[PDB]
């Protein structure tokens, strides 16, 4: 049976969460049976990135989807550009990979005020390396020893054998490329099935996304 689409989508539970995931353990939340008003989301805060792929950005208040997935994590400023299709680097290769045919939006903002501390916040981690690149929307939460050279590890950390996770360090005096950014990736599912997420019935065209 076709779904009820009357409630407003609970974007606040994602965007306003107290503590974000570490990027290697990025958190996914399914969004369904609700009305996504992107004009309201866009005006809810000052975002430094708000870019959509695989979809017309101005049509977002009129488009319908079978599901929306909201993926959230923290990275440093210089890495936000890697959250896009066809990028490479430590984040895109080993932590969070978007597909080439990505359908969704990437939303990010500077969280120096919340996520950095005098003396340094080490609470957020990233993965340093993997034997192979992540597939799109793959999550790796394992902690196997990575053989960085020609010495066999036999499961032991040591010479040329590295533990694969690493703390960021977030102090408010960091340069902006080393300051924390909270990221939300909205993935739009398009299965051949009844829509469960739609824009508002009486909607303005989502024009404000053009004038950043």
């Amino acid at each position, epitope marked *: 049976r076709f779904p009820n689409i009357t409630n407003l989508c609970p974007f606040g539970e994602v965007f306003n969460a107290t503590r974000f995931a570490s990027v290697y353990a990025w958190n996914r939340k399914r969004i369904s049976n609700c009305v996504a008003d992107y004009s309201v989301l866009y005006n809810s805060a000052s975002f430094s990135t708000f870019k959509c792929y695989g979809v017309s950005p101005t049509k977002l208040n009129d488009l319908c989807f079978t599901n929306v997935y909201a993926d959230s994590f923290v990275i440093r400023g210089d890495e936000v550009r890697q959250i896009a299709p066809g990028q490479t680097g430590k984040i895109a290769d080993y932590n969070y990979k978007l597909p080439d045919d990505f359908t969704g939006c990437v939303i990010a903002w500077n969280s120096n005020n919340l996520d950095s*501390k005098v003396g340094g916040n080490y*609470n957020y981690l990233y993965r340093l390396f993997r034997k192979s690149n992540l597939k799109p929307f793959e999550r790796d939460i*394992s902690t196997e020893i990575y053989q960085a050279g020609s010495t066999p590890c036999n499961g032991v950390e040591g010479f040329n054998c590295y533990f694969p996770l690493q703390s960021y360090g977030f102090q408010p005096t960091n340069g902006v490329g080393y300051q924390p950014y909270r990221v939300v990736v909205l993935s739009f599912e398009l299965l051949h099935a009844p829509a469960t997420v739609c824009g508002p019935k009486k909607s303005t065209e989502f024009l404000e996304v053009l004038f950043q």
Partner: nanobody
Amino acid sequence: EVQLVESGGGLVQPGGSLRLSCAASDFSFYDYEMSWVRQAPGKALEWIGSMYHSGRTYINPSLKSLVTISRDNSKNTLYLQMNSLRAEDTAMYYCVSNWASGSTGDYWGQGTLVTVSS
């Protein structure tokens, strides 16, 4: 009822050690991570270290010289050992499952208070 219970914990002299423990209802609480986290008065939540499902550990790089984390799998119990404690180390100490998943995907213990002074 409560699924994550810290014990140990109480008064410590400056320069002393304390060992904390955390008993889990189930071993799935170590999938994928179990963490020790503390909160000092005045201060923000500070992650101390984690033990991952594999049995390996990663410690806050600014505290690694003072902290050890270990597990007893039969008892579903995680241990925190800290040495050379100072007044700064007075805090509520918590055991958190899947801390790296953020506040919407984690599971918190009740906490145990550790107080340092003369």
